[PDB]
Amino acid sequence: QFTERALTILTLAQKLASDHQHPQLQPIHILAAFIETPEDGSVPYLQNLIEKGRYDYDLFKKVVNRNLVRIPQQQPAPAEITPSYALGKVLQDAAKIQKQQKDSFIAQDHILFALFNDSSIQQIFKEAQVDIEAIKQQALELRGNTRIDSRGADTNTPLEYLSKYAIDMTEQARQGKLDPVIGREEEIRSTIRVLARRIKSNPCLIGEPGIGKTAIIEGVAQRIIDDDVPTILQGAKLFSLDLAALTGDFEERFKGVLKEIEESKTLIVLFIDEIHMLMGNAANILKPALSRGQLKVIGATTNNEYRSIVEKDGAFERRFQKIEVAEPSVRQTVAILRGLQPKYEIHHGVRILDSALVTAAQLAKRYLPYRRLPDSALDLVDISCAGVAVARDSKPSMIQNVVDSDTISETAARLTGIPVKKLSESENEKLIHMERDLSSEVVGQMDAIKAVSNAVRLSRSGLANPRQPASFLFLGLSGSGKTELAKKVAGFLFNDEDMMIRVDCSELSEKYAVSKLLGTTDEGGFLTNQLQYKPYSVLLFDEVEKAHPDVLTVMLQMLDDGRITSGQGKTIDCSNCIVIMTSNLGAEFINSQQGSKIQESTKNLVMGAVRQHFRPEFLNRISSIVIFNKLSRKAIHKIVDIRLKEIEERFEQNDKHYKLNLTQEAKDFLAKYGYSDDMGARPLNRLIQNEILNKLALRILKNEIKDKETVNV
Amino acid sequence: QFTERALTILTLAQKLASDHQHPQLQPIHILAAFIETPEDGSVPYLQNLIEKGRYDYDLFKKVVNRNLVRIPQQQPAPAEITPSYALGKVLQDAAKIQKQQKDSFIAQDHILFALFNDSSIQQIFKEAQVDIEAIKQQALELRGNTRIDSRGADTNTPLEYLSKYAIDMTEQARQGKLDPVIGREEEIRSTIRVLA
Amino acid sequence: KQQKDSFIAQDHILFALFNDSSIQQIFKEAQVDIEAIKQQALELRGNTRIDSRGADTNTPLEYLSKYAIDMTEQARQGKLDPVIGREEEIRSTIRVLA
Amino acid sequence: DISCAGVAVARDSKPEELDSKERQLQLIQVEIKALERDEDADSTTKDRLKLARQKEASLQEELEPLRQRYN
Numbered sequence A: 001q002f003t004e005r006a007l008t009i010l011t012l013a014q015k016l017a018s019d020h021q022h023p024q025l026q027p028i029h030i031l032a033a034f035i036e037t038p039e040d041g042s043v044p045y046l047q048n049l050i051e052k053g054r055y056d057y058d059l060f061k062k063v064v065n066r067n068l069v070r071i072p073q074q075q076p077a078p079a080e081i082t083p084s085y086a087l088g089k090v091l092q093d094a095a096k097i098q099k100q101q102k103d104s105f106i107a108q109d110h111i112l113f114a115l116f117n118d119s120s121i122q123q124i125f126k127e128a129q130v131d132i133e134a135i136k137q138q139a140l141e142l143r144g145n146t147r148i149d150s151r152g153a154d155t156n157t158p159l160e161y162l163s164k165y166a167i168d169m170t171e172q173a174r175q176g177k178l179d180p181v182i183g184r185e186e187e188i189r190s191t192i193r194v195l196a197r198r199i200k201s202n203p204c205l206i207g208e209p210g211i212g213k214t215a216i217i218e219g220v221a222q223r224i225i226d227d228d229v230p231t232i233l234q235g236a237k238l239f240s241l242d243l244a245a246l247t248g249d250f251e252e253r254f255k256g257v258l259k260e261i262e263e264s265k266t267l268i269v270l271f272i273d274e275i276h277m278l279m280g281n282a283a284n285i286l287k288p289a290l291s292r293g294q295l296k297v298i299g300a301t302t303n304n305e306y307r308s309i310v311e312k313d314g315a316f317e318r319r320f321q322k323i324e325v326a327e328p329s330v331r332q333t334v335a336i337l338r339g340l341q342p343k344y345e346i347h348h349g350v351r352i353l354d355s356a357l358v359t360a361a362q363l364a365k366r367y368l369p370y371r372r373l374p375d376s377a378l379d380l381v382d383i384s385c386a387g388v389a390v391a392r393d394s395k396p397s398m399i400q401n402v403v404d405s406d407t408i409s410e411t412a413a414r415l416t417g418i419p420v421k422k423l424s425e426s427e428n429e430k431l432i433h434m435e436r437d438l439s440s441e442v443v444g445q446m447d448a449i450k451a452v453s454n455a456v457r458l459s460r461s462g463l464a465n466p467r468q469p470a471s472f473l474f475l476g477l478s479g480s481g482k483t484e485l486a487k488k489v490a491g492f493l494f495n496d497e498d499m500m501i502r503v504d505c506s507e508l509s510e511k512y513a514v515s516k517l518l519g520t521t522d523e524g525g526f527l528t529n530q531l532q533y534k535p536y537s538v539l540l541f542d543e544v545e546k547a548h549p550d551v552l553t554v555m556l557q558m559l560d561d562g563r564i565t566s567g568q569g570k571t572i573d574c575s576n577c578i579v580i581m582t583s584n585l586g587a588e589f590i591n592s593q594q595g596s597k598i599q600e601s602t603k604n605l606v607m608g609a610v611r612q613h614f615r616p617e618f619l620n621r622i623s624s625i626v627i628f629n630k631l632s633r634k635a636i637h638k639i640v641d642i643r644l645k646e647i648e649e650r651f652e653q654n655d656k657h658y659k660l661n662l663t664q665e666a667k668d669f670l671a672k673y674g675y676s677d678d679m680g681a682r683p684l685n686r687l688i689q690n691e692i693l694n695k696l697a698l699r700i701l702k703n704e705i706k707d708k709e710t711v712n713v
Numbered sequence B: 001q002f003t004e005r006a007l008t009i010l011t012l013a014q015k016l017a018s019d020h021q022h023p024q025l026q027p028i029h030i031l032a033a034f035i036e037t038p039e040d041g042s043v044p045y046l047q048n049l050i051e052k053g054r055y056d057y058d059l060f061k062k063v064v065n066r067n068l069v070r071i072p073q074q075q076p077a078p079a080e081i082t083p084s085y086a087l088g089k090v091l092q093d094a095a096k097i098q099k100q101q102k103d104s105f106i107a108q109d110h111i112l113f114a115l116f117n118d119s120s121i122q123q124i125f126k127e128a129q130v131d132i133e134a135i136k137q138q139a140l141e142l143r144g145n146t147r148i149d150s151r152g153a154d155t156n157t158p159l160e161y162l163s164k165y166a167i168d169m170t171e172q173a174r175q176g177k178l179d180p181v182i183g184r185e186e187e188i189r190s191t192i193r194v195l196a
Numbered sequence C: 001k002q003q004k005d006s007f008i009a010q011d012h013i014l015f016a017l018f019n020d021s022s023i024q025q026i027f028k029e030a031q032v033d034i035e036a037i038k039q040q041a042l043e044l045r046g047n048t049r050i051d052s053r054g055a056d057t058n059t060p061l062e063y064l065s066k067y068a069i070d071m072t073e074q075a076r077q078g079k080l081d082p083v084i085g086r087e088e089e090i091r092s093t094i095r096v097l098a
Numbered sequence D: 001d002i003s004c005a006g007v008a009v010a011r012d013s014k015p016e017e018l019d020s021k022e023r024q025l026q027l028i029q030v031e032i033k034a035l036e037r038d039e040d041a042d043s044t045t046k047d048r049l050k051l052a053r054q055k056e057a058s059l060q061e062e063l064e065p066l067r068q069r070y071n
């Protein structure tokens, strides 16, 4: 039976016979119904079955221009009020070729197919078109199996189906639309390598989003239109799915392409983005036909996405090769950064200095966890582009070239902040002065600090395995810098308080591999999240001495490789991560520091304890273990003052401008009552406000303090 | 007042009769002025309500200048000097469909519309402008919402009811109709930034 | 084509037989030309019977297709690969049917 | 088959070694471009432009003769 778009074809010739008020349904109505507009946009028109197959229709278009208009006048009601079986035998008569394309019901050409019998101007110059086979011929010769039922423009587009969802950038290549690619070359060649196998030509590309996985396809196709596509491969061209709404459940449409491209004679390729569809319920789609062994197909993913369906399946695996896409090098970035460098600055009507370009690639490489310098650099760039180009655009211009700095800096400032660190000194002088920097926090443990400052350089220069943590287990008490130190650490290192990340073993006696994010069975993402939020980071564990067989055993991986697996299966870099461990074990021996005990002696004395509490392997990834020992007034009162230093931070700083007085006795009193042997004046610290702030807040309440009015005890 | 878009053609139609310096403004003139070239950038060719309504202009592209070259030549000042109320009515006559099709000003269809009598090949073989037959037909095809207000853009379904689902505030902007938000450019700082 | 087929089956030959295979006379035993065959070919196969094989659908049948498929003919068609070495292995698998 | 590919790959198109040379060619040739584009005392024509033009002259030779094996 007819297509609904044949009905829509019918609609037009009728709508013609409606608007142009033809009193009956005649042979020649359906050409205007056929022709969309003078375009070949109708499968009947020019690229059509007709012109190329046997004779040009544009002629029989050019002439029927009148035939359309030679219809007589009507009055309002009667126009085309009849089905006109003279024409309307095609209601039955069109059933000729409907199935013979291996189909269901009648189509545009196919109703027309019976029209060469029915609808035609068969005359001295016979206007009847492609004659015996030629229609059916060209019905097959153009697409063919051109329609099924009612769905999609009846003999849509110049050809048939696909081309709606068929997307080819070899065009855009040969159209120049495509970005040149870099450095995925033999990677492509490996993808290319995928392609020869009678067993599996079908790749899958594992790796981070935004890495270029689709942009990969460029060079794929680019080298294809370069005819770096090899012999077998040359015949194919670019095609890949642009996921269409099915518009009940129309995957038949998406089934449509399948044999279509299958019939299409290997002229193209199939690439598939990411969800290679696992529906929660459509399940096998194309999969068996996909499993047939024709139908070249490309996969791409990152780990867990790959881990989604195929782990069930394995047939994808059975039907594919998975191929990791390595996050490209910074210079891979830097290089292909320059690729659209001219572009985006011209996109943004500006100029660039590679100075920034590398600089972001330098800097930003660390600082966007989620997105990828494989893009984010550029993403910074467009970002870098605009606002300054905006500072050009409506008015805020002479700056056209990207500044190095602000384009990173200000944007980094836009991105995060505290440029001054991110501004100049990179990787290095921080180190030399790190200790003397860190010497701020609490004196003593300086060696450890040095060792830290050492180990962080062990953490650098890649001498120590660039895949490996920085392994730090600390001894002391509350107040002692397991208490503290991390605060400085990333604040020094990552310039943050929160790259420091809190973990308590007391929480974890048994199963926390459960809440580590186990394999979903209810989402334990925390640890993962902790990095998955925060990749360049500092890892504080608490009660580490009580670390239980569970938590410690992943500590091993944490100890290992500078990488962290998940329960969902993702592994996650620990290398750029810093690990921090509360250990109070030798608290005895720590307490013995009353004797100001020979450290190593008491360390050795301690060691056995910790040596007991931990298998060596643990101990033997540990990059150091140190006490946080006895405190000197020298230390103390300064450390005291340290908070006293920063009192202002909101107060005299971001609020009050309060002009500070302290009596040294009080400054000592601080130590005096306040310093706790075991816990320090860290308890008094909590107290401080009481004896300090409220004491002032009192005056604040009073107003005996006006700004700078200050009286203390 | 006439539609600018219409008047854009109209004065260009006055310009049309000026280039060959026609003696008079007469029905078959703007049949050339309606069309820069067959591009739907000139709608009167294909996108015209007639090619879809009645008379396709493809080969009917042929005859328009054929007349305006065969007009008796004139000199500059008498060119576009006259409405020639035979044509000069189209000024007013364009206001006839604005009622049947429900419009207010005089638009590209209307300037076109009025012409539907003699602007043509009117003969035994008449390649011409049907009177109500092409437009009221296809002035719904085109558009369907003829009213464009006192100030408006192309009056032929600009994006298919683009102003009937989304207000333009740049109206009210250009119209100055909303209290400009404040401390908001740093937001905008994002926006424009967000854009490019 | 209206039987929606690449090949011409035993319903299709009879389909043409609807004229000279008939008694079309004063008392007409014709053969129903279009109406009855089609929808009863909509009963019996469909496009489902593309064609290109041996032929099987006599009496109550004309199915064993779609999911039903065989590679034996395909092997006689040489559609597939000569195996090795699982012979006596197959000898078992074979002898299982016994 | 993968080997059969890898050969064909090489055999499929220009022998990796050829395209490897094609590759490294493409590497700096675009790099050297952007360098002098701006007024610089450091990244300008001084350093890498001289570096590349020799570095490009290093492996440029074998290509067409080793392509002449295909000829």
Ligand SMILES: Nc1ncnc2c1ncn2[C@@H]1O[C@H](COP(=O)(O)OP(=O)(O)OP(=O)(O)O)[C@@H](O)[C@H]1O
Residues within 6 Å of the ligand: A179, A180, A181, A182, A184, A208, A209, A210, A211, A212, A213, A214, A215, A216, A218, A273, A274, A336, A339, A374, A375
């Ligand atoms: N090698 C490359 N050559 C050219 N452009 C690239 C390259 N890598 C990335 N891009 C650019 O990155 C943008 C999109 O990145 P892309 O989507 O390819 O990353 P992705 O890992 O493929 O994420 P997706 O899942 O969408 O494929 C495009 O503008 C593209 O031009």
Ligand SMILES: Nc1ncnc2c1ncn2[C@@H]1O[C@H](COP(=O)(O)OP(=O)(O)OP(=O)(O)O)[C@@H](O)[C@H]1O
Residues within 6 Å of the ligand: A440, A441, A442, A477, A478, A479, A480, A481, A482, A483, A484, A485, A639, A640, A642, A643, A680, A682, A685
């Ligand atoms: N090494 C140190 N570096 C910086 N501040 C220190 C240090 N030692 C003591 N302090 C003081 O202690 C304050 C912070 O104490 P902190 O929050 O680190 O204790 P904690 O985090 O509760 O850990 P714990 O329970 O093991 O003591 C600082 O503001 C400072 O005044």
